PDB file of all heavy atoms in Angstrom:
ATOM      1  N   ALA A 203      23.848   4.695 -86.580  1.00  0.00           N
ATOM      2  CA  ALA A 203      23.252   4.587 -87.907  1.00  0.00           C
ATOM      3  C   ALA A 203      23.353   3.167 -88.444  1.00  0.00           C
ATOM      4  O   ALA A 203      22.405   2.658 -89.053  1.00  0.00           O
ATOM      5  CB  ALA A 203      23.916   5.572 -88.867  1.00  0.00           C
ATOM      6  N   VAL A 204      24.499   2.511 -88.238  1.00  0.00           N
ATOM      7  CA  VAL A 204      24.655   1.132 -88.692  1.00  0.00           C
ATOM      8  C   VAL A 204      23.643   0.229 -87.997  1.00  0.00           C
ATOM      9  O   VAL A 204      22.978  -0.599 -88.633  1.00  0.00           O
ATOM     10  CB  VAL A 204      26.097   0.648 -88.458  1.00  0.00           C
ATOM     11  CG1 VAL A 204      26.157  -0.868 -88.453  1.00  0.00           C
ATOM     12  CG2 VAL A 204      27.018   1.212 -89.523  1.00  0.00           C
ATOM     13  N   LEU A 205      23.502   0.391 -86.680  1.00  0.00           N
ATOM     14  CA  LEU A 205      22.541  -0.417 -85.936  1.00  0.00           C
ATOM     15  C   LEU A 205      21.118  -0.174 -86.422  1.00  0.00           C
ATOM     16  O   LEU A 205      20.345  -1.122 -86.608  1.00  0.00           O
ATOM     17  CB  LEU A 205      22.656  -0.115 -84.443  1.00  0.00           C
ATOM     18  CG  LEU A 205      21.714  -0.878 -83.514  1.00  0.00           C
ATOM     19  CD1 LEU A 205      22.008  -2.369 -83.557  1.00  0.00           C
ATOM     20  CD2 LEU A 205      21.820  -0.345 -82.095  1.00  0.00           C
ATOM     21  N   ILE A 206      20.755   1.092 -86.637  1.00  0.00           N
ATOM     22  CA  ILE A 206      19.396   1.419 -87.055  1.00  0.00           C
ATOM     23  C   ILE A 206      19.107   0.857 -88.440  1.00  0.00           C
ATOM     24  O   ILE A 206      18.025   0.313 -88.689  1.00  0.00           O
ATOM     25  CB  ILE A 206      19.175   2.940 -86.998  1.00  0.00           C
ATOM     26  CG1 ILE A 206      18.989   3.395 -85.550  1.00  0.00           C
ATOM     27  CG2 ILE A 206      17.976   3.340 -87.833  1.00  0.00           C
ATOM     28  CD1 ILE A 206      18.107   2.479 -84.729  1.00  0.00           C
ATOM     29  N   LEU A 207      20.060   0.982 -89.366  1.00  0.00           N
ATOM     30  CA  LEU A 207      19.859   0.435 -90.703  1.00  0.00           C
ATOM     31  C   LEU A 207      19.743  -1.082 -90.665  1.00  0.00           C
ATOM     32  O   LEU A 207      18.915  -1.666 -91.373  1.00  0.00           O
ATOM     33  CB  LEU A 207      20.998   0.865 -91.625  1.00  0.00           C
ATOM     34  CG  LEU A 207      20.908   2.289 -92.173  1.00  0.00           C
ATOM     35  CD1 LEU A 207      21.731   2.417 -93.436  1.00  0.00           C
ATOM     36  CD2 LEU A 207      19.465   2.682 -92.431  1.00  0.00           C
ATOM     37  N   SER A 208      20.565  -1.740 -89.843  1.00  0.00           N
ATOM     38  CA  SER A 208      20.461  -3.189 -89.714  1.00  0.00           C
ATOM     39  C   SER A 208      19.097  -3.594 -89.175  1.00  0.00           C
ATOM     40  O   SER A 208      18.501  -4.570 -89.643  1.00  0.00           O
ATOM     41  CB  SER A 208      21.572  -3.716 -88.807  1.00  0.00           C
ATOM     42  OG  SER A 208      21.085  -3.951 -87.497  1.00  0.00           O
ATOM     43  N   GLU A 209      18.588  -2.858 -88.185  1.00  0.00           N
ATOM     44  CA  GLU A 209      17.266  -3.166 -87.649  1.00  0.00           C
ATOM     45  C   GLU A 209      16.175  -2.939 -88.689  1.00  0.00           C
ATOM     46  O   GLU A 209      15.258  -3.758 -88.822  1.00  0.00           O
ATOM     47  CB  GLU A 209      16.998  -2.327 -86.400  1.00  0.00           C
ATOM     48  N   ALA A 210      16.257  -1.837 -89.437  1.00  0.00           N
ATOM     49  CA  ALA A 210      15.195  -1.472 -90.365  1.00  0.00           C
ATOM     50  C   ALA A 210      15.216  -2.282 -91.654  1.00  0.00           C
ATOM     51  O   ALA A 210      14.189  -2.347 -92.339  1.00  0.00           O
ATOM     52  CB  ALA A 210      15.277   0.018 -90.701  1.00  0.00           C
ATOM     53  N   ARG A 211      16.353  -2.889 -92.005  1.00  0.00           N
ATOM     54  CA  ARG A 211      16.400  -3.704 -93.215  1.00  0.00           C
ATOM     55  C   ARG A 211      15.441  -4.882 -93.122  1.00  0.00           C
ATOM     56  O   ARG A 211      14.737  -5.200 -94.088  1.00  0.00           O
ATOM     57  CB  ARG A 211      17.824  -4.197 -93.467  1.00  0.00           C
ATOM     58  CG  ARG A 211      17.897  -5.396 -94.397  1.00  0.00           C
ATOM     59  CD  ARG A 211      19.255  -5.497 -95.064  1.00  0.00           C
ATOM     60  NE  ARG A 211      19.182  -6.174 -96.353  1.00  0.00           N
ATOM     61  CZ  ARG A 211      19.028  -7.482 -96.509  1.00  0.00           C
ATOM     62  NH1 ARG A 211      18.939  -8.297 -95.471  1.00  0.00           N
ATOM     63  NH2 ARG A 211      18.967  -7.985 -97.739  1.00  0.00           N
ATOM     64  N   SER A 212      15.387  -5.532 -91.964  1.00  0.00           N
ATOM     65  CA  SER A 212      14.514  -6.678 -91.764  1.00  0.00           C
ATOM     66  C   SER A 212      13.054  -6.284 -91.589  1.00  0.00           C
ATOM     67  O   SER A 212      12.203  -7.169 -91.456  1.00  0.00           O
ATOM     68  CB  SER A 212      14.984  -7.489 -90.556  1.00  0.00           C
ATOM     69  OG  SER A 212      16.398  -7.533 -90.498  1.00  0.00           O
ATOM     70  N   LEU A 213      12.744  -4.990 -91.583  1.00  0.00           N
ATOM     71  CA  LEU A 213      11.368  -4.523 -91.528  1.00  0.00           C
ATOM     72  C   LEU A 213      10.822  -4.138 -92.894  1.00  0.00           C
ATOM     73  O   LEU A 213       9.667  -3.709 -92.988  1.00  0.00           O
ATOM     74  CB  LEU A 213      11.248  -3.331 -90.572  1.00  0.00           C
ATOM     75  CG  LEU A 213       9.898  -3.192 -89.869  1.00  0.00           C
ATOM     76  CD1 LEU A 213       9.794  -4.187 -88.725  1.00  0.00           C
ATOM     77  CD2 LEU A 213       9.682  -1.768 -89.382  1.00  0.00           C
ATOM     78  N   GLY A 214      11.614  -4.282 -93.951  1.00  0.00           N
ATOM     79  CA  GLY A 214      11.163  -3.936 -95.281  1.00  0.00           C
ATOM     80  C   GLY A 214      11.230  -2.467 -95.622  1.00  0.00           C
ATOM     81  O   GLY A 214      10.794  -2.082 -96.711  1.00  0.00           O
ATOM     82  N   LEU A 215      11.766  -1.634 -94.735  1.00  0.00           N
ATOM     83  CA  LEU A 215      11.862  -0.203 -94.995  1.00  0.00           C
ATOM     84  C   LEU A 215      12.932   0.144 -96.020  1.00  0.00           C
ATOM     85  O   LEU A 215      13.174   1.332 -96.256  1.00  0.00           O
ATOM     86  CB  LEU A 215      12.131   0.553 -93.692  1.00  0.00           C
ATOM     87  CG  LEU A 215      10.917   1.140 -92.968  1.00  0.00           C
ATOM     88  CD1 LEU A 215      10.439   2.401 -93.669  1.00  0.00           C
ATOM     89  CD2 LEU A 215       9.788   0.126 -92.860  1.00  0.00           C
ATOM     90  N   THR A 216      13.577  -0.847 -96.624  1.00  0.00           N
ATOM     91  CA  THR A 216      14.542  -0.631 -97.690  1.00  0.00           C
ATOM     92  C   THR A 216      14.069  -1.344 -98.947  1.00  0.00           C
ATOM     93  O   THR A 216      13.433  -2.401 -98.873  1.00  0.00           O
ATOM     94  CB  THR A 216      15.939  -1.129 -97.294  1.00  0.00           C
ATOM     95  OG1 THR A 216      16.822  -1.027 -98.418  1.00  0.00           O
ATOM     96  CG2 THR A 216      15.883  -2.571 -96.821  1.00  0.00           C
ATOM     97  N   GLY A 217      14.366  -0.756-100.098  1.00  0.00           N
ATOM     98  CA  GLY A 217      13.953  -1.352-101.350  1.00  0.00           C
ATOM     99  C   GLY A 217      14.430  -0.535-102.528  1.00  0.00           C
ATOM    100  O   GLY A 217      15.290   0.336-102.399  1.00  0.00           O
ATOM    101  N   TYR A 218      13.855  -0.839-103.692  1.00  0.00           N
ATOM    102  CA  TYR A 218      14.186  -0.087-104.895  1.00  0.00           C
ATOM    103  C   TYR A 218      13.701   1.353-104.825  1.00  0.00           C
ATOM    104  O   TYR A 218      14.213   2.200-105.564  1.00  0.00           O
ATOM    105  CB  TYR A 218      13.604  -0.777-106.129  1.00  0.00           C
ATOM    106  CG  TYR A 218      14.641  -1.493-106.962  1.00  0.00           C
ATOM    107  CD1 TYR A 218      14.654  -2.879-107.048  1.00  0.00           C
ATOM    108  CD2 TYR A 218      15.609  -0.785-107.657  1.00  0.00           C
ATOM    109  CE1 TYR A 218      15.601  -3.537-107.806  1.00  0.00           C
ATOM    110  CE2 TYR A 218      16.561  -1.435-108.416  1.00  0.00           C
ATOM    111  CZ  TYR A 218      16.553  -2.811-108.487  1.00  0.00           C
ATOM    112  OH  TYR A 218      17.499  -3.461-109.243  1.00  0.00           O
ATOM    113  N   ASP A 219      12.725   1.651-103.964  1.00  0.00           N
ATOM    114  CA  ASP A 219      12.275   3.023-103.722  1.00  0.00           C
ATOM    115  C   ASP A 219      12.263   3.249-102.212  1.00  0.00           C
ATOM    116  O   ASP A 219      11.220   3.150-101.562  1.00  0.00           O
ATOM    117  CB  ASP A 219      10.906   3.270-104.348  1.00  0.00           C
ATOM    118  N   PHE A 220      13.438   3.562-101.662  1.00  0.00           N
ATOM    119  CA  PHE A 220      13.564   3.926-100.251  1.00  0.00           C
ATOM    120  C   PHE A 220      14.866   4.713-100.127  1.00  0.00           C
ATOM    121  O   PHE A 220      15.948   4.120-100.132  1.00  0.00           O
ATOM    122  CB  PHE A 220      13.557   2.701 -99.357  1.00  0.00           C
ATOM    123  CG  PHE A 220      12.196   2.326 -98.868  1.00  0.00           C
ATOM    124  CD1 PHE A 220      11.698   1.051 -99.075  1.00  0.00           C
ATOM    125  CD2 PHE A 220      11.406   3.251 -98.210  1.00  0.00           C
ATOM    126  CE1 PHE A 220      10.439   0.706 -98.626  1.00  0.00           C
ATOM    127  CE2 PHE A 220      10.147   2.912 -97.759  1.00  0.00           C
ATOM    128  CZ  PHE A 220       9.662   1.637 -97.967  1.00  0.00           C
ATOM    129  N   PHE A 221      14.755   6.029-100.019  1.00  0.00           N
ATOM    130  CA  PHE A 221      15.901   6.918-100.160  1.00  0.00           C
ATOM    131  C   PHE A 221      16.303   7.468 -98.797  1.00  0.00           C
ATOM    132  O   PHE A 221      15.609   8.321 -98.235  1.00  0.00           O
ATOM    133  CB  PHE A 221      15.580   8.036-101.144  1.00  0.00           C
ATOM    134  CG  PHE A 221      15.433   7.559-102.553  1.00  0.00           C
ATOM    135  CD1 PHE A 221      14.778   8.325-103.496  1.00  0.00           C
ATOM    136  CD2 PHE A 221      15.951   6.333-102.934  1.00  0.00           C
ATOM    137  CE1 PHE A 221      14.644   7.878-104.793  1.00  0.00           C
ATOM    138  CE2 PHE A 221      15.822   5.882-104.226  1.00  0.00           C
ATOM    139  CZ  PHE A 221      15.168   6.655-105.158  1.00  0.00           C
ATOM    140  N   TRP A 222      17.423   6.978 -98.277  1.00  0.00           N
ATOM    141  CA  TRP A 222      18.008   7.499 -97.054  1.00  0.00           C
ATOM    142  C   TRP A 222      18.992   8.606 -97.392  1.00  0.00           C
ATOM    143  O   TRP A 222      19.706   8.533 -98.395  1.00  0.00           O
ATOM    144  CB  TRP A 222      18.732   6.398 -96.282  1.00  0.00           C
ATOM    145  CG  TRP A 222      17.911   5.195 -96.016  1.00  0.00           C
ATOM    146  CD1 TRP A 222      17.679   4.162 -96.867  1.00  0.00           C
ATOM    147  CD2 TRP A 222      17.227   4.879 -94.802  1.00  0.00           C
ATOM    148  NE1 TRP A 222      16.881   3.223 -96.265  1.00  0.00           N
ATOM    149  CE2 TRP A 222      16.591   3.642 -94.993  1.00  0.00           C
ATOM    150  CE3 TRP A 222      17.088   5.526 -93.573  1.00  0.00           C
ATOM    151  CZ2 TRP A 222      15.826   3.038 -94.004  1.00  0.00           C
ATOM    152  CZ3 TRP A 222      16.329   4.925 -92.593  1.00  0.00           C
ATOM    153  CH2 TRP A 222      15.707   3.694 -92.812  1.00  0.00           C
ATOM    154  N   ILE A 223      19.022   9.635 -96.553  1.00  0.00           N
ATOM    155  CA  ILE A 223      20.023  10.690 -96.648  1.00  0.00           C
ATOM    156  C   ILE A 223      20.501  11.013 -95.240  1.00  0.00           C
ATOM    157  O   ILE A 223      19.685  11.197 -94.332  1.00  0.00           O
ATOM    158  CB  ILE A 223      19.473  11.946 -97.346  1.00  0.00           C
ATOM    159  CG1 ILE A 223      19.229  11.664 -98.826  1.00  0.00           C
ATOM    160  CG2 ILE A 223      20.443  13.088 -97.205  1.00  0.00           C
ATOM    161  CD1 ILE A 223      18.165  12.531 -99.438  1.00  0.00           C
ATOM    162  N   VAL A 224      21.815  11.078 -95.058  1.00  0.00           N
ATOM    163  CA  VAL A 224      22.396  11.259 -93.730  1.00  0.00           C
ATOM    164  C   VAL A 224      23.433  12.376 -93.768  1.00  0.00           C
ATOM    165  O   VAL A 224      24.007  12.649 -94.831  1.00  0.00           O
ATOM    166  CB  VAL A 224      23.014   9.948 -93.222  1.00  0.00           C
ATOM    167  CG1 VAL A 224      21.924   8.991 -92.783  1.00  0.00           C
ATOM    168  CG2 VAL A 224      23.861   9.320 -94.306  1.00  0.00           C
ATOM    169  N   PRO A 225      23.702  13.044 -92.648  1.00  0.00           N
ATOM    170  CA  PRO A 225      24.694  14.124 -92.645  1.00  0.00           C
ATOM    171  C   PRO A 225      26.111  13.594 -92.793  1.00  0.00           C
ATOM    172  O   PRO A 225      26.374  12.392 -92.745  1.00  0.00           O
ATOM    173  CB  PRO A 225      24.488  14.791 -91.284  1.00  0.00           C
ATOM    174  CG  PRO A 225      23.894  13.728 -90.439  1.00  0.00           C
ATOM    175  CD  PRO A 225      23.017  12.926 -91.352  1.00  0.00           C
ATOM    176  N   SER A 226      27.039  14.537 -92.972  1.00  0.00           N
ATOM    177  CA  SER A 226      28.432  14.190 -93.223  1.00  0.00           C
ATOM    178  C   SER A 226      29.060  13.423 -92.071  1.00  0.00           C
ATOM    179  O   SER A 226      30.067  12.737 -92.277  1.00  0.00           O
ATOM    180  CB  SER A 226      29.244  15.453 -93.503  1.00  0.00           C
ATOM    181  OG  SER A 226      29.480  16.178 -92.312  1.00  0.00           O
ATOM    182  N   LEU A 227      28.501  13.526 -90.864  1.00  0.00           N
ATOM    183  CA  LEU A 227      29.059  12.794 -89.735  1.00  0.00           C
ATOM    184  C   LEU A 227      28.970  11.292 -89.957  1.00  0.00           C
ATOM    185  O   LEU A 227      29.908  10.553 -89.637  1.00  0.00           O
ATOM    186  CB  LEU A 227      28.342  13.189 -88.446  1.00  0.00           C
ATOM    187  CG  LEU A 227      28.888  12.529 -87.182  1.00  0.00           C
ATOM    188  CD1 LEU A 227      29.123  13.567 -86.099  1.00  0.00           C
ATOM    189  CD2 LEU A 227      27.943  11.445 -86.694  1.00  0.00           C
ATOM    190  N   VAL A 228      27.848  10.822 -90.504  1.00  0.00           N
ATOM    191  CA  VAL A 228      27.708   9.401 -90.807  1.00  0.00           C
ATOM    192  C   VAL A 228      28.721   8.984 -91.865  1.00  0.00           C
ATOM    193  O   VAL A 228      29.263   7.873 -91.827  1.00  0.00           O
ATOM    194  CB  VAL A 228      26.265   9.088 -91.243  1.00  0.00           C
ATOM    195  CG1 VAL A 228      26.113   7.611 -91.549  1.00  0.00           C
ATOM    196  CG2 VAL A 228      25.287   9.513 -90.163  1.00  0.00           C
ATOM    197  N   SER A 229      28.994   9.865 -92.822  1.00  0.00           N
ATOM    198  CA  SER A 229      30.027   9.617 -93.825  1.00  0.00           C
ATOM    199  C   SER A 229      31.379   9.824 -93.160  1.00  0.00           C
ATOM    200  O   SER A 229      31.943  10.920 -93.167  1.00  0.00           O
ATOM    201  CB  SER A 229      29.848  10.537 -95.025  1.00  0.00           C
ATOM    202  OG  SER A 229      30.613  11.718 -94.872  1.00  0.00           O
ATOM    203  N   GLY A 230      31.910   8.755 -92.577  1.00  0.00           N
ATOM    204  CA  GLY A 230      33.170   8.841 -91.869  1.00  0.00           C
ATOM    205  C   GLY A 230      34.357   8.422 -92.708  1.00  0.00           C
ATOM    206  O   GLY A 230      34.792   9.164 -93.595  1.00  0.00           O
ATOM    207  N   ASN A 231      34.895   7.238 -92.431  1.00  0.00           N
ATOM    208  CA  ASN A 231      36.032   6.745 -93.194  1.00  0.00           C
ATOM    209  C   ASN A 231      35.633   6.494 -94.641  1.00  0.00           C
ATOM    210  O   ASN A 231      34.502   6.094 -94.935  1.00  0.00           O
ATOM    211  CB  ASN A 231      36.577   5.462 -92.565  1.00  0.00           C
ATOM    212  N   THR A 232      36.571   6.740 -95.550  1.00  0.00           N
ATOM    213  CA  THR A 232      36.352   6.535 -96.974  1.00  0.00           C
ATOM    214  C   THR A 232      36.565   5.091 -97.401  1.00  0.00           C
ATOM    215  O   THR A 232      36.367   4.774 -98.578  1.00  0.00           O
ATOM    216  CB  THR A 232      37.276   7.447 -97.785  1.00  0.00           C
ATOM    217  OG1 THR A 232      38.564   6.832 -97.911  1.00  0.00           O
ATOM    218  CG2 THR A 232      37.431   8.792 -97.094  1.00  0.00           C
ATOM    219  N   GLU A 233      36.965   4.211 -96.479  1.00  0.00           N
ATOM    220  CA  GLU A 233      37.229   2.821 -96.829  1.00  0.00           C
ATOM    221  C   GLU A 233      36.667   1.846 -95.799  1.00  0.00           C
ATOM    222  O   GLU A 233      37.162   0.718 -95.697  1.00  0.00           O
ATOM    223  CB  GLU A 233      38.733   2.581 -96.988  1.00  0.00           C
ATOM    224  N   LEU A 234      35.649   2.242 -95.040  1.00  0.00           N
ATOM    225  CA  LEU A 234      35.086   1.416 -93.978  1.00  0.00           C
ATOM    226  C   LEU A 234      33.581   1.274 -94.151  1.00  0.00           C
ATOM    227  O   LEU A 234      32.800   1.477 -93.221  1.00  0.00           O
ATOM    228  CB  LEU A 234      35.413   1.990 -92.603  1.00  0.00           C
ATOM    229  CG  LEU A 234      36.519   1.284 -91.818  1.00  0.00           C
ATOM    230  CD1 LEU A 234      36.140  -0.161 -91.539  1.00  0.00           C
ATOM    231  CD2 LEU A 234      37.845   1.362 -92.553  1.00  0.00           C
TER     232      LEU A 234
END
């Protein structure tokens, strides 16, 4: 997920209106 988000950030797929939702597995450590 980190790799995919890093790749997609430079493609403009992120912005003030771009809503990602991921399962609890991606939500791992609470401080990382």
Side-chain angles (χ1 to χ4, degrees), residues 203-208 210-218 220-230 232 234:
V204 160
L205 180 64
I206 284 318
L207 281 202
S208 100
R211 161 157 207 285
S212 322
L213 210 78
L215 264 284
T216 174
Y218 255 112
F220 268 125
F221 292 161
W222 307 82
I223 291 154
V224 285
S226 75
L227 183 131
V228 180
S229 93
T232 83
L234 256 299

